[PDB]
Structures are given as structure tokens and as C-alpha cells.
Write a protein that binds this ligand. Sequence first.
Ligand SMILES: Cc1cccc(C)c1OCC(=O)N[C@@H](Cc1ccccc1)[C@@H](O)C[C@H](Cc1ccccc1)NC(=O)[C@H](C(C)C)N1CCCNC1=O
Lengths: 99, 99
Amino acid sequence: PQITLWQRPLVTIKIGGQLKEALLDTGADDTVLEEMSLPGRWKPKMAGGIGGFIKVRQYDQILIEICGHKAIGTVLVGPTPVNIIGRNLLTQIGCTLNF
Amino acid sequence: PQITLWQRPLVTIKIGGQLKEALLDTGADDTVLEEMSLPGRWKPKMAGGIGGFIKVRQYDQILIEICGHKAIGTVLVGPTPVNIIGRNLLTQIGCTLNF
Ligand SMILES: Cc1cccc(C)c1OCC(=O)N[C@@H](Cc1ccccc1)[C@@H](O)C[C@H](Cc1ccccc1)NC(=O)[C@H](C(C)C)N1CCCNC1=O
């Protein structure tokens, strides 16, 4: 689908058997999800946004189903205000900017 | 142009007679630019991303040329680590997401 940007580009993702709403975010290198129940081993990391840094849990090779399309990659989990889908997953679903 | 997301989507902007590189950011509501020389009256305002909030100077109706396309709108200037073009300008150059 083509998405215009008059609204926040919020899509429906399915991750860890759960349904969530996330923002397709071209300005993000990585995917960062709010505190949620995820299975597996992890490694502690920091993510540097606009106001500073947040301590997140890094999970590798996690499956997300973004708006009907499937991707497998790195997901960070931490105290972020919005669920962010970054470029590490957006490339896998073939997402492009167009103007 | 079509822009894929394997790299940061950086475009050349021209603002206030000057050339800068800015990130095309679907995950940003507003346009925020690194400390730079702009003419005009401003209003103090507060942008909050991941990790907290930054104090910015708000200018209304700044002309920006993004990758050859002209746009006029609100530009925030503050201690952002990256120049960010947000949806308030992205909508004006007919920028869409596609997958
Ligand atoms: C939401 C908003 C409203 C008004 C104005 C602005 C600029 C707004 O956006 C601010 C903002 O931080 N938006 C983020 C997503 C957002 C929306 C709403 C709330 C919080 C965040 C994201 O798109 C841009 C921002 C850019 C950046 C900052 C520092 C270093 C490098 C890049 N990118 C990042 O933080 C990403 C994260 C998300 C994985 N990131 C951080 C690790 C290094 N690389 C990287 O890519």
C-alpha cells in the first residue's frame, strides 16, 4: 500500500503472538518497542534519540508481521513513548519513500 | 525520486541561503534542524523524542528546498544531533511511503 503522511503512519504489527500498533519510521535505524512480553535471551543496549539515551533490551532474529508482511530481525524493548519500526525491518518488507 | 531505506534517507536541503543534509523522517511530526543562522522572530517551544525533551526556537513559514522541491512551514532550531525533515514539510513535497 501507499501511505501518505498527513497522519502518523501507524500500522498493525503482530509480534510475540500479540497485536500492537507501530509507527513506520524512516528516521530510525532500529526497531524499538514499548515494554512488552518477549521470549528469548537478550543483551543490554542504549538507544540515542532526540532528548538523550534510553536503556533497552536487544533481541535478535525476532519475527514481526507488519501490515500483513513478514520480517525477521533485531527488536529493542525499552521505555519508548511510541512503538517504532525502523529501517532494519522496513527494508525487509520493501518499504520506499516516494516524491 | 524513489528512495530505499538500506541507508539513512539523507537529502540536500537549502534553508536560509545555506546548504545542509537532512534526514527524511516519516516518524517525525515536525522538522527540527541543528543550531543554525536563521532570520526572523521566534517563539520558545519544547520537542520531546526518545530519551527526553529539547528546548528549541520555533520559526513559522520558513522556505526550505528539499531535493529541488520547495516547501514553506514551521522549522524548529535546537540542539538536535541530526537535521530532521518531519511530516509537516514531507506532505508538501508529495512524499509517500510504499511497500
Ligand atoms: C515525534 C516528533 C515530534 C516533533 C518533532 C520531532 C523531530 C519528532 O521526532 C523526534 C524523534 O526523535 N523521532 C524519532 C521517532 C520518535 C517518535 C516519537 C517519540 C520518540 C521517537 C526518529 O524518527 C528520529 C530519531 C533521529 C536520531 C536521533 C539521534 C541519533 C540518531 C538519529 N531517531 C531515533 O531516535 C532512532 C530510534 C527511534 C531507533 N535512532 C536512535 C539511535 C541511533 N539511531 C536511530 O535511528
